[PDB]
Structure 1
Amino acid sequence: GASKLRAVLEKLKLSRDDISTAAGMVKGVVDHLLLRLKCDSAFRGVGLLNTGSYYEHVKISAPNEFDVMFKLEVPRIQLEEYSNTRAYYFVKFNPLSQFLEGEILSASKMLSKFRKIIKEEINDIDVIMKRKRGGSPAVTLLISEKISVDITLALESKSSWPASTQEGLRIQNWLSAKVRKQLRLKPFYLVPKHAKQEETWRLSFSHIEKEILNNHGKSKTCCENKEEKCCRKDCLKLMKYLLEQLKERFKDKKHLDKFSSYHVKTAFFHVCTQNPQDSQWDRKDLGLCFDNCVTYFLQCLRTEKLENYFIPEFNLFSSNLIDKRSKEFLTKQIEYERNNEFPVFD
């Protein structure tokens, strides 16, 4: 059918929409941090990645877990690709001079002061800070009991996208070549991240993702007739929720640890490329459309191939990233869900 899936999406929608003081608590903390960082020599160009009043919830089942990004513009950037990894880069070349080690911008130093400044502002305020191996997210704050906020520091570059993206973002037959060109004129972001430990940064395009999801049809009027939607966004929510529920179901074992929403999002956008017509996403076909997505993700697990949507030579499912045993384990869980009308969805 398609009836149970609607009930799941309705539950998720009402949980997200219900009245809550959490966004206001998060806002007060964030505004406090931004004011403090702006009067520091290294962070005076810092600001929120998106200045909307609705915060980012990466975990679709967790309305008390917030994700925020602080962006810092860096003029005249020089990038050097690290170890042929396509997605990881040294930063070379002003205010960030204090973090150089040679010609190379040190992420770990920059995070240390970012953390320290945030640490000394938290005490000035019911907020607590936790350091855990990371840096993207750089800092996790906890507000009262339930509310948590991940803060990521990102560099912004307004120069052309790196060569590794030249053949990515293959939306030309879905969103048009005109739109691909406008999107590629937008800035790109870099977040501190190791590939496996050097001073490397990873390309981040979460603003492009958000723009496409809000203007996602082949037809420009897609989903504007509010009673005859497409089901693209619902399919992506369902895929996100499937992985989150399986990860929770098996938090005691380790096999699903390396999977994240990047993997589900990526597979979904490949199915959007595969199926560019809005008629392939009719809301009546929610169940069949979700099954296309599930089926494609399962093909990717079995072939151990999932190309990054922006950098096609980066294989998210390579065996050095996620080993065979872990991919084979997620395959069997998903095919049990698929064959039993998704028990995690009730």
Structure 2
Amino acid sequence: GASKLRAVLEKLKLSRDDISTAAGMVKGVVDHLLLRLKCDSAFRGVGLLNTGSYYEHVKISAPNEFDVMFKLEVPRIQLEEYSNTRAYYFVKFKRNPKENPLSQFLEGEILSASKMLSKFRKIIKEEINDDTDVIMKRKRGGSPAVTLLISEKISVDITLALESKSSWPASTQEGLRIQNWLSAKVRKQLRLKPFYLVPKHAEETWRLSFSHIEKEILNNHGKSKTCCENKEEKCCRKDCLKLMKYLLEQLKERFKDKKHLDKFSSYHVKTAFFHVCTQNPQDSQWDRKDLGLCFDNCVTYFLQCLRTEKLENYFIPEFNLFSSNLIDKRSKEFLTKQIEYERNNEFPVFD
């Protein structure tokens, strides 16, 4: 009973892969900012998080909204957990040449995020005009730090991130519970990769970012090493993630006039999806023939998290994404009812 879901997926895939000049405009704008930022005193080591991440799309229904991350390496960094929040940190410096590039943003021993953004934004804001109609926005703030608009259609969220090649902070030690699915060998390898810090609040605090580990898992997602390398070992994991993402997006669109869904994002959906991967580690539990059932397991688990108001961060297990101080009871109950409506009516949002 997959026929409608496949067609949704087919429609979505054709609009992703269709010939477009968007990635080209985005890349020339970004190479522009990278040259300009590289000449400034604080941003001399700035670089793209991934060569080829010009075409990173958070919104899976909008192929002209691009998501771009700029990375800056902070060697010998001192993290201090903020207010037992497990996920938010002050950045301090071990300062060996106490005039490290970032020192001009120090207030006390503490790295200021808002000051760093002000100059990042100001450098970008002036570099914007000296080709194309690149407009920016001081909207929202935080992360995304800067949203550019190329012409009318194309939109580029730029996020600035600190990179640390030391071992991941102690709040991750019992997370990424992939041992029964991707193996303990692979968990070790992943935790040997650097971690990233972006600004956000719940003061001058930073938050862990793991989009690179997510990408890595999704590009090597099977218990079997040959998963999805032919169509005989073809699994529906990635397609379920797509259908989860698209369902929230269409509900966020349908109900934008109200407000109850403003706090949910694809991060809540990704997180719940990887928990289901842990719960179902076998590739035979993700057979393409069973797309319909497999999607339904994801939708069932997410609804269970909403109803119990528990969805543990996949990397930091003491952090509850659905805690009532983060999203109130009336918002989860609202999203609970819309998803149950969709499931019981063979998903009208997919039309």
- Count the aligned residue pairs: 344
Residue by residue, what CA displacement relative to the aligned partner does 1:8-36 show, whole Å, maximum 9, x if unpaired? 00000000000000000000000000000
Alignment root-mean-square deviation, CA:
0.9
Residue by residue, what CA displacement relative to the aligned partner does 1:26-64 show, whole Å, maximum 9, x if unpaired? 000000000000000100100000111651100000000
Residue by residue, what CA displacement relative to the aligned partner does 1:94-126 show, whole Å, maximum 9, x if unpaired? 111110001000000000000000001002961
Is the partner of 2:47 in helix, strand or coil? strand
Residue by residue, what CA displacement relative to the aligned partner does 1:145-192 show, whole Å, maximum 9, x if unpaired? 110000000000000101100100000000000000000000000001
**Kindly tell me: are residues 20 and 321 of structure 1, through their superposed partners in 2, closer, same or farther at Cα, counting changes over 3 Å?**
same
**Kindly tell me: are residues 285 and 74 of structure 1, through their superposed partners in 2, closer, same or farther at Cα, counting changes over 3 Å?**
same
Separation in 1, partners of 2:109, 2:314: 31
Shift, 1:132, TM fit? 1.2
Unaligned runs of 5+ residues in structure 1 are: none
Separation in 1, partners of 2:52, 2:251: 31
Which residue does 2:231 correspond to in 1? 226
Shift, 1:229, TM fit? 1.1
TM-score, normalised to structure 1, is: 0.98
Residue by residue, what CA displacement relative to the aligned partner does 1:276-308 show, whole Å, maximum 9, x if unpaired? 000000000000000000000000000000000
Shift, 1:227, TM fit? 5.2
Which residue does 1:98 correspond to in 2? 104
Shift, 1:228, TM fit? 4.1
Separation in 1, partners of 2:141, 2:169: 24
Shift, 1:130, TM fit? 0.3
Q: Does residue 327 in structure 1 map to residue 332 in structure 2?
A: yes
Separation in 1, partners of 2:132, 2:91: 34
Shift, 1:204, TM fit? 0.5
Percent identity reads 100
Unaligned runs of 5+ residues in structure 2 are: 94-99
Is the partner of 2:285 in helix, strand or coil? helix
Separation in 2, partners of 1:53, 1:177: 28
Shift, 1:202, TM fit? 0.4
Shift, 1:134, TM fit? 2.1
Shift, 1:226, TM fit? 3.5
Does the CA-based 8 Å contact 2:80-2:92 persist in structure 1?
yes
Does the CA-based 8 Å contact 2:132-2:151 persist in structure 1?
no
TM-score, normalised to structure 2, is: 0.97
Is the partner of 1:160 in helix, strand or coil? coil
Separation in 1, partners of 2:159, 2:148: 11
Q: Does residue 170 in structure 1 map to residue 177 in structure 2?
A: yes
Is the partner of 1:84 in helix, strand or coil? coil
Is the partner of 1:155 in helix, strand or coil? strand
Shift, 1:87, TM fit? 0.5
**Kindly tell me: are residues 54 and 45 of structure 1, through their superposed partners in 2, closer, same or farther at Cα, counting changes over 3 Å?**
closer
Separation in 2, partners of 1:163, 1:228: 37
